[PDB]
Design a binder for these strands. Sequence first.
RNA 1: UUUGCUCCACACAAUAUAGAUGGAUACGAAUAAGGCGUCCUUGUGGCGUCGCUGAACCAUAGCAGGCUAGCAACGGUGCACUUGGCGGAAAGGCCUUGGGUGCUUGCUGGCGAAUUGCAAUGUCAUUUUGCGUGGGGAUAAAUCAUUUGUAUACGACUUAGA
RNA 2: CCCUGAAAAUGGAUGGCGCUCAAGCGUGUUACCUAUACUCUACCGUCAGGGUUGAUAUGAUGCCCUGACGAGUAGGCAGGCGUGGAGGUCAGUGACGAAGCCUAGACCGUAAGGUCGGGUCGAACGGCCUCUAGUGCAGAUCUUGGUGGUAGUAGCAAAUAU
RNA 3: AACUGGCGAUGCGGGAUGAACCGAACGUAGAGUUAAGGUGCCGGAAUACACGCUCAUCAGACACCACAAAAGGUGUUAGUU
RNA 4: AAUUGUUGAAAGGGAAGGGCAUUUGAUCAGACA
Lengths: 49, 111, 172, 197, 127, 106
Amino acid sequence: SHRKYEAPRHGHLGFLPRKRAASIRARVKAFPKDDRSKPVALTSFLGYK
Amino acid sequence: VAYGYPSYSTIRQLVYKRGFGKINKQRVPLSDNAIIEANLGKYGILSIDDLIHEIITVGPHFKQANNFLWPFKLSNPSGGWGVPRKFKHFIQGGSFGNREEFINKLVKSMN
Amino acid sequence: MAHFKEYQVIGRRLPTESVPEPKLFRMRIFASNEVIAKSRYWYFLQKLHKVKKASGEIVSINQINEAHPTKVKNFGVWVRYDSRSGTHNMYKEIRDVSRVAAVETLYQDMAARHRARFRSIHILKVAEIEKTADVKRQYVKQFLTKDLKFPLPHRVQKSTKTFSYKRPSTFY
Amino acid sequence: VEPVVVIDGKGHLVGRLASVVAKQLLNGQKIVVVRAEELNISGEFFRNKLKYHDFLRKATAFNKTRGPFHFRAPSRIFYKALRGMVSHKTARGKAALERLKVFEGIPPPYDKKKRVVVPQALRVLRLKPGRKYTTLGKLSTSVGWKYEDVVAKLEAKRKVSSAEYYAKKRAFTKKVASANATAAESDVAKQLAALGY
Amino acid sequence: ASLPHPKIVKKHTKKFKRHHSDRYHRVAENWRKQKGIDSVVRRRFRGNISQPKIGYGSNKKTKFLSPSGHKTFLVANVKDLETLTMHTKTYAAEIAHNISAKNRVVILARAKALGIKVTNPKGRLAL
Amino acid sequence: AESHRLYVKGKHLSYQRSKRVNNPNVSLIKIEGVATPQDAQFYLGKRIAYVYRASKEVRGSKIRVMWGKVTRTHGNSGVVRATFRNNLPAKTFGASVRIFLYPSNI
RNA sequence: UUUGCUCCACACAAUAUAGAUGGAUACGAAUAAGGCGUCCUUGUGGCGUCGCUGAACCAUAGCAGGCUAGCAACGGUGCACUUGGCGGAAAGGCCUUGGGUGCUUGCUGGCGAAUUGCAAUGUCAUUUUGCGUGGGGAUAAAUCAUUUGUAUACGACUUAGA
RNA sequence: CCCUGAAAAUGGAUGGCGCUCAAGCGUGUUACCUAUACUCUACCGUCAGGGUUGAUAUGAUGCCCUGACGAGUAGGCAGGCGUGGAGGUCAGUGACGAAGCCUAGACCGUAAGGUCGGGUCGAACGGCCUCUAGUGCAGAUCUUGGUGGUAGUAGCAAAUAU
RNA sequence: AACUGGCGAUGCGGGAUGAACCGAACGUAGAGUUAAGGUGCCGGAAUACACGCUCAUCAGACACCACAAAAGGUGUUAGUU
RNA sequence: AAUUGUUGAAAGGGAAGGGCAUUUGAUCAGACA
Ligand SMILES: [Mg+2]
Ligand SMILES: [Mg+2]
Ligand SMILES: [Mg+2]
Ligand SMILES: [Mg+2]
Ligand SMILES: [Mg+2]
Ligand SMILES: [Mg+2]
Ligand SMILES: [Mg+2]
Ligand SMILES: [Mg+2]
Ligand SMILES: [Mg+2]
Ligand SMILES: [Mg+2]
Ligand SMILES: [Mg+2]
Ligand SMILES: [Mg+2]
Ligand SMILES: [Mg+2]
Ligand SMILES: [Mg+2]
Ligand SMILES: [Mg+2]
Ligand SMILES: [Mg+2]
Ligand SMILES: [Mg+2]
Ligand SMILES: [Mg+2]
Ligand SMILES: [Mg+2]
Ligand SMILES: [Mg+2]
Ligand SMILES: [Mg+2]
Ligand SMILES: [Mg+2]
Ligand SMILES: [Mg+2]
Ligand SMILES: [Mg+2]
Ligand SMILES: [Mg+2]
Ligand SMILES: [Mg+2]
Ligand SMILES: [Mg+2]
Ligand SMILES: [Mg+2]
Ligand SMILES: [Mg+2]
Ligand SMILES: [Mg+2]
Ligand SMILES: [Mg+2]
Ligand SMILES: [Mg+2]
Ligand SMILES: [Mg+2]
Ligand SMILES: [Mg+2]
Ligand SMILES: [Mg+2]
Ligand SMILES: [Mg+2]
Ligand SMILES: [Mg+2]
Ligand SMILES: [Mg+2]
Ligand SMILES: [Mg+2]
Ligand SMILES: [Mg+2]
Ligand SMILES: [Mg+2]
Ligand SMILES: [Mg+2]
Ligand SMILES: [Mg+2]
Ligand SMILES: [Mg+2]
Ligand SMILES: [Mg+2]
Ligand SMILES: [Mg+2]
Ligand SMILES: [Mg+2]
Ligand SMILES: [Mg+2]
Ligand SMILES: [Mg+2]
Ligand SMILES: [Mg+2]
Ligand SMILES: [Mg+2]
Ligand SMILES: [Mg+2]
Ligand SMILES: [Mg+2]
Ligand SMILES: [Mg+2]
Ligand SMILES: [Mg+2]
Ligand SMILES: [Mg+2]
Ligand SMILES: [Mg+2]
Ligand SMILES: [Mg+2]
Ligand SMILES: [Mg+2]
Ligand SMILES: [Mg+2]
Ligand SMILES: [Mg+2]
Ligand SMILES: [Mg+2]
Ligand SMILES: [Mg+2]
Ligand SMILES: [Mg+2]
Ligand SMILES: [Mg+2]
Ligand SMILES: [Mg+2]
Ligand SMILES: [Mg+2]
Ligand SMILES: [Mg+2]
Ligand SMILES: [Mg+2]
Ligand SMILES: [Mg+2]
Ligand SMILES: [Mg+2]
Ligand SMILES: [Mg+2]
Ligand SMILES: [Mg+2]
Ligand SMILES: [Mg+2]
Ligand SMILES: [Mg+2]
Ligand SMILES: [Mg+2]
Ligand SMILES: [Mg+2]
Ligand SMILES: [Mg+2]
Ligand SMILES: [Mg+2]
Ligand SMILES: [Mg+2]
Ligand SMILES: [Mg+2]
Ligand SMILES: [Mg+2]
Ligand SMILES: [Mg+2]
Ligand SMILES: [Mg+2]
Ligand SMILES: [Mg+2]
Ligand SMILES: [Mg+2]
Ligand SMILES: [Mg+2]
Ligand SMILES: [Mg+2]
Ligand SMILES: [Mg+2]
Ligand SMILES: [Mg+2]
Ligand SMILES: [Mg+2]
Ligand SMILES: [Mg+2]
Ligand SMILES: [Mg+2]
Ligand SMILES: [Mg+2]
Ligand SMILES: [Mg+2]
Ligand SMILES: [Mg+2]
Ligand SMILES: [Mg+2]
Ligand SMILES: [Mg+2]
Ligand SMILES: [Mg+2]
Ligand SMILES: [Mg+2]
Ligand SMILES: [Mg+2]
Ligand SMILES: [Mg+2]
Ligand SMILES: [Mg+2]
Ligand SMILES: [Mg+2]
Ligand SMILES: [Mg+2]
Ligand SMILES: [Mg+2]
Ligand SMILES: [Mg+2]
Ligand SMILES: [Mg+2]
Ligand SMILES: [Mg+2]
Ligand SMILES: [Mg+2]
Ligand SMILES: [Mg+2]
Ligand SMILES: [Mg+2]
Ligand SMILES: [Mg+2]
Ligand SMILES: [Mg+2]
């Protein structure tokens, strides 16, 4: 038939699949655009929560 | 049917090559002049070309001379049919009915 | 309907006791073989006279060979055809080299531009246009202007193997 | 004829190349297609953009992964035009396909081999002058194909090294047809001339 | 040495095997004709097994002839083996299956004596 | 010298077929450089070999041959029908094949 | 754990093979325009030439291509070596120096070929593996169990342990 | 001819790919592809027409020539194949191995079926002419028995505790 | 309801697909020729020939058959008064 | 017999099995004389 009362979907599909991840160190899928005029230094860093 | 007007040339080449006789049925190949003579000799006709003559002229004995000949048995035309669809009249670009002088070329391809 | 020949045809109302030598009418049929040509002759006579094939006879069927087959001519053409919504007369002009080679492209033009097949056309009249400037239609008049010339650009060559090692020209 | 046939896609109408590539494949002729991004399609870019989107919408409902896969790169579009002209689910089809390679640009080996052309799919010969058509690179890039700039970078450098290559070549064949002219009018040469050579 | 005969032409060497004899055990390969009303087989749909018909029957010339050229006749003792005495170019003798070992050697022997072929000349042969 | 080929190169294209049933009794042969079916009435009645390999040695080689003959011309493009001692495999579809020069007529 | 592993060398063996049997022979771009040669004021340049198919070009003669003599050249090509350099798109291949060496049908010779009996692919590709031989080179780890809890229904994850 | 008029529910269908001086539309010209159809030949079976008792060898419902035909449910008829028992007979087979059972070994038959090798076995059994019927199975939610997949699965958790 | 032809009881070739459409009705085979239908590739078979027409920001593409209409257009085409 | 264990050979990209035909592997008859 047709819902009855429209209402939004539970959950966000752009976080699929809900599997456990490859490793504990989630990966940087991206880095800042490069400004090759600045001095050079690292663009991320690591620590422990 | 497709039909029309045979020539002596294609009456000749039909009898010679595919003409058989009805001799107590038995669809009998012609192949010797004394096959004819024994059965159409009655009415004249004592040679294969005697047959041809009595056919091609519709002479006095064309009924028994004709029916003596067992219905001919042609192949599909060699060149093909020249029409694309056959079951229209000849005049309408198909293959049936009287096409006259041309019934020959057709026959001389099916023989 | 095929590759065309012109045929004069001649028939006459089968003689009777009290009317021997009936009157003889001729047509000029535009057909492919002599068997169609006589068919058309009767098709059209029964559109004018009280005849049919059943009661008449063809007196002579004779092919007519174009008089000057290496003299380009400008042909006017007169036609009647049936459309999907009624029937109508026309006039076209065909530039070619024999009355018959024109009747060929006519039936093609009628077919391509007006979706009309053989069965729906009637060739009212084909006529060699003597003096120029009686040439009414433009797609013809183009070809009658003095010292006419014209290139054939972007020329395209029929390759005889599947692969080529050049890279074509269209030069000419 | 040849062990492998290298095809310079540039200037070739998708389906008319796919058609001839399919047939060379199935008759046992290994083929490699290059510069697939420079491939052509009849109709202006919008019609072919619209067309790819129509494709793009078809997917398995309960699971978009199992359904039709849409590939963006000018070569995979080309392989797709091909594969559907091949009985590709048969043993024989997988056979014929493995004889085929498609690339963007002209990568190594094939940049030094000679690449060949297909007149019967050559747009400049096929299409009517004045029709509008589509370049597969632009069409790919507009639906997700990533590497359009990198390829033309890599190519703009290829076509340099090759002009040099050709340059030395044309310079040398000037000597060869030079030496070839001292040898003319000799006894040898005029004899060959008689035998057609 | 067998009387001379046209090339033996078999016509359909393959065994006609019952429909779905290959699909349920219960169903022997022993030919049976499909009498049901839908059966593709009975209907001769294109790609199903074919059925036994009288066009397949062998040339009366070569019919019954084994490879050699000899219509094999079954034999239980010398008396029977003797019925072939004036016929050896035409009629091999197959020893019957229940004939003992001491009695095939009488029969084998006598075969050689008289010039008759023995088809299964090895059964219970003391080797 | 470097070359020893006394035959013309060929390819095993299809069996004879309709749209939907084939006929392994005729194979159809593509002869290199033969284009019209005028061009291909020269190879009529020539003998054809599909040569191939195997792992069991036989009469003292590991090389085998299936022998055949061109028999008629097939359609407008210089393909040729041919029949063989045994029918060619179907795996051989798009495998090479030798049309010889014999029987000859020059 | 029975002297194993690996790169180069040859030998025998096995097992393959979607299908060698002279050579996949490199500008780019245009097509209502271009390639090549040449000249100059280096241009969107003058002048010449060509296309109309690779029907080309290169190669190709020699026991499947054997054994040998010489001449004219100083050219060609095969190989293994070395000189300098280029190529990262998948470079893994290209160009160059210099000797050594094989061949050369560029030309002129000596010798051989049969009997495979009038055809029977008449065998000369390249895959991968296996076993011994000796010419270089190399001496790990992962798992079970135990263990953490940043993990977990179970497997799995994450730690820790000479 | 093209466009507008022209709005539905999984994602998708000129059969697919794809095609634009078409691989589109109308029309013309040829060439070409291939049904169990047509033509010719071979073989099988059916029907028909003829020939042939003359002994001294083997079939007279036989032998020989000849022509034409061959779809099939329900259904008719025909000619054959296989079982249990019965009369006749082959002075049939067999403890030097009957019957049975096994056998991607062999041969005959268009087929039902028939024959043989080898293995296993242990007491009986068969050809031919006749006689006879409790005479042929895939099915009937068939009868009785045996066996699988399911599956080492559901589960083996009330009654406090060891 | 009528006449015929069919399907049923019938496979074969074409119509992708399909009881009835097209073709053609079946003993076992060989060689050939064809029907209906087709011949870019899938797919055997001319990316054949010739004249036109069509460019669609939801072109179009073969009977039965898997639908579209009135009404419009200064797109272009050829005709009429 | 269904069904099962072992052993041996072989095939297996969303069933299996079948038709015509041939490659290859294994196995076999007859026929030369
Ligand atoms: Mg709602
Ligand atoms: Mg509510
Ligand atoms: Mg990323
Ligand atoms: Mg990244
Ligand atoms: Mg023909
Ligand atoms: Mg001809
Ligand atoms: Mg025809
Ligand atoms: Mg048609
Ligand atoms: Mg004929
Ligand atoms: Mg008429
Ligand atoms: Mg009228
Ligand atoms: Mg009219
Ligand atoms: Mg052409
Ligand atoms: Mg191949
Ligand atoms: Mg899917
Ligand atoms: Mg596809
Ligand atoms: Mg293949
Ligand atoms: Mg063009
Ligand atoms: Mg049989
Ligand atoms: Mg049954
Ligand atoms: Mg039914
Ligand atoms: Mg059924
Ligand atoms: Mg005995
Ligand atoms: Mg036994
Ligand atoms: Mg025994
Ligand atoms: Mg095939
Ligand atoms: Mg064919
Ligand atoms: Mg064969
Ligand atoms: Mg294959
Ligand atoms: Mg193939
Ligand atoms: Mg392979
Ligand atoms: Mg280059
Ligand atoms: Mg330049
Ligand atoms: Mg220039
Ligand atoms: Mg220049
Ligand atoms: Mg200067
Ligand atoms: Mg300059
Ligand atoms: Mg200039
Ligand atoms: Mg060249
Ligand atoms: Mg040499
Ligand atoms: Mg010499
Ligand atoms: Mg010297
Ligand atoms: Mg030297
Ligand atoms: Mg790299
Ligand atoms: Mg690569
Ligand atoms: Mg590298
Ligand atoms: Mg040297
Ligand atoms: Mg040499
Ligand atoms: Mg050799
Ligand atoms: Mg070692
Ligand atoms: Mg330690
Ligand atoms: Mg139009
Ligand atoms: Mg859906
Ligand atoms: Mg549609
Ligand atoms: Mg189509
Ligand atoms: Mg199309
Ligand atoms: Mg057309
Ligand atoms: Mg012609
Ligand atoms: Mg043609
Ligand atoms: Mg049929
Ligand atoms: Mg037949
Ligand atoms: Mg009688
Ligand atoms: Mg019947
Ligand atoms: Mg019977
Ligand atoms: Mg009985
Ligand atoms: Mg009984
Ligand atoms: Mg019993
Ligand atoms: Mg028992
Ligand atoms: Mg056993
Ligand atoms: Mg067995
Ligand atoms: Mg078994
Ligand atoms: Mg058997
Ligand atoms: Mg037997
Ligand atoms: Mg036997
Ligand atoms: Mg035994
Ligand atoms: Mg026993
Ligand atoms: Mg006992
Ligand atoms: Mg008894
Ligand atoms: Mg009885
Ligand atoms: Mg009972
Ligand atoms: Mg039953
Ligand atoms: Mg049964
Ligand atoms: Mg049951
Ligand atoms: Mg039962
Ligand atoms: Mg039943
Ligand atoms: Mg039961
Ligand atoms: Mg039970
Ligand atoms: Mg169970
Ligand atoms: Mg348990
Ligand atoms: Mg449990
Ligand atoms: Mg419970
Ligand atoms: Mg308590
Ligand atoms: Mg009807
Ligand atoms: Mg009926
Ligand atoms: Mg009913
Ligand atoms: Mg009926
Ligand atoms: Mg029917
Ligand atoms: Mg069909
Ligand atoms: Mg049809
Ligand atoms: Mg029709
Ligand atoms: Mg396809
Ligand atoms: Mg084809
Ligand atoms: Mg649309
Ligand atoms: Mg709209
Ligand atoms: Mg819509
Ligand atoms: Mg469209
Ligand atoms: Mg209509
Ligand atoms: Mg349809
Ligand atoms: Mg209205
Ligand atoms: Mg309207
Ligand atoms: Mg209008
Ligand atoms: Mg009007
Ligand atoms: Mg799967
Ligand atoms: Mg002998």
